[PDB]
Amino acid sequence: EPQFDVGIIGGGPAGSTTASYLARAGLKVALFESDNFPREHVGESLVPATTPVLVDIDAFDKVEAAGFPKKFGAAWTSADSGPSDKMGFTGLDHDFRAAEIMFNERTQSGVHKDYTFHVDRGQFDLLLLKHAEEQGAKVHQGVRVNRVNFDGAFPVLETSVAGQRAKVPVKMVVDASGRRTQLGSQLKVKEKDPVFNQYAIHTWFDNFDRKALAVDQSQSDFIFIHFLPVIDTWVWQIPITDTITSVGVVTQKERLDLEKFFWDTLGSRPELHKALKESEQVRPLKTEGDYSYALTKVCGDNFLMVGDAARFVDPIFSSGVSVALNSARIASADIIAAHRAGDYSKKRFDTYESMLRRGVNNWYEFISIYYRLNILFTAFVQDPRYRIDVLKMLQGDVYDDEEPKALAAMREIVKAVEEDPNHLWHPFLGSLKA
Ligand SMILES: Cc1cc2nc3c(=O)[nH]c(=O)nc-3n(C[C@H](O)[C@H](O)[C@H](O)COP(=O)(O)OP(=O)(O)OC[C@H]3O[C@@H](n4cnc5c(N)ncnc54)[C@H](O)[C@@H]3O)c2cc1C
What we know:
By secondary structure, the chain is of the alpha+beta class. The chain is about 35% helix and about 25% strand. Flavin-adenine dinucleotide binds next to helix 1, strand 2, strand 9 and helix 9. InterPro entries: FAD-bd, FAD/NAD-bd_sf, Flavin-dep_Halogenase_NPB.
């Protein structure tokens, strides 16, 4: 039998977190990362559901010590003021133009702080990858996994070392290759979402004064997500340091030169546009895929996928890294139990498969509602009857519940509205549907 219990493809948040859980449990873990860290990567704003996982693997203190900007909350704004009839919803202080939350408004199990972080992902992924090594994981960088061979009793990772093929047998493979979906693509189980086909254009700016433009100065270090309903396009502002800010524009592929589209979109708000033009652009505009997909298989005999390698959803709720960390957590529990049973057949991962489906279905449905009736999202966040149940989702706490209270409530309102073209809210239904 192979020396190594588990071979991990990729050393981003999902891969490094998996390595840390498994190494801490005493399994022999080999991890292979194609790049050398640090390397640039989008996806910077965390939610607090990352916290219990960072504490589990004892990485929270290092992350806190690194000096990433603290994130106490989030704001979602829209260009649409919405209907005059608020239908009994309260807390809409700016019509339907603005919703805002602080994470500390709801007590979250395993979370001991009022804040999470926004992170330079180059630095964050390096920090976590070195941490995994310190836990006892065997980490390789500059070493790509080209394929997984299933011809033997145990899977073999075919890696590439200076143009040479190095075949590494392991008992169990974890694909944590992110959007590269290394194993899902090999197995041909990857299904692109017919509807969520987003792409992003984004960069960093230096010496843009977040606090100067903020309508609530105390909130200048929140993430801000601005929605443009008419063109189903969103715009992010994410703190990177005290002086650097990440700004991105996200839109359907069909709607997509690029530099001009980026700026015209930001120009929907002349003084943000101005402030950014007058700041220092510290990186080229980058355009990348942001499209949704799901694998029809996320596990099988001697393999499973975690993080983006398993599924992707539009990160309007800053969800991705929390899925990476929590899929790692849940998958690692099944792997440790499988190791204890001396068997890695598909059934060993039934719980991981169900929980991943449940949690990311919850995100997907939440995201669907945001797009389908955005004014209802705004109302549910703001109205104190529903705010806390909605905040549970926004905190990333989506693994608890096959049928979250807020999601079911919102779902039937969308239905009621869809099925009555007389509804005063009917005209606000968005074109992006399920
Ligand atoms: C535009 C955009 C904005 C986003 N914003 C946010 C946000 O605000 N908050 C948030 O939480 N999430 C966000 N996300 C999502 C987030 O970036 C991902 O969910 C996250 O990176 C998932 O981590 P991961 O470890 O699964 O994948 P990754 O972080 O991508 O890591 C995978 C690693 O695998 C390596 N790899 C790939 N193939 C191979 C191979 N064959 N062999 C070896 N190594 C390999 C790669 O080099 C990479 O380092 C955003 C995503 C996009 C596209």
